[PDB]
């Protein structure tokens, strides 16, 4: 792991596996999320709406 490789997700780790992007362009929760960290089944698509654990609790 190169120290320059960006980290992501709730877990603050580099990219690995399947990842999903928070729909919020201004996401402050980690932008991209490893499927396992967010309860998604590996090697599946996710066609519809998805917010990360932070953005899904933000007031609208």
């Amino acid at each position: 792991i190169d120290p320059n490789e960006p980290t992501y997700c709730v877990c603050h780790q580099v990219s690995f596996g399947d990842m999903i992007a928070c729909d919020n362009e201004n996401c402050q929760g980690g932008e991209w999320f490893h499927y396992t960290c967010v309860g998604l089944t590996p090697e599946t698509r996710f066609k519809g709406k998805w917010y990360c654990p932070t953005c899904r609790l933000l007031p609208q």
């Binding site: 990219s15 690995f16 399947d18 990842m19 999903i20 992007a21 729909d23 519809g48 998805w50």
Partner: peptide, 9 residues
């Protein structure tokens, strides 16, 4: 949602 598969397991 946008999803991706990355090389690293």
């Amino acid at each position: 949602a946008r999803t991706k598969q990355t090389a690293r397991k």
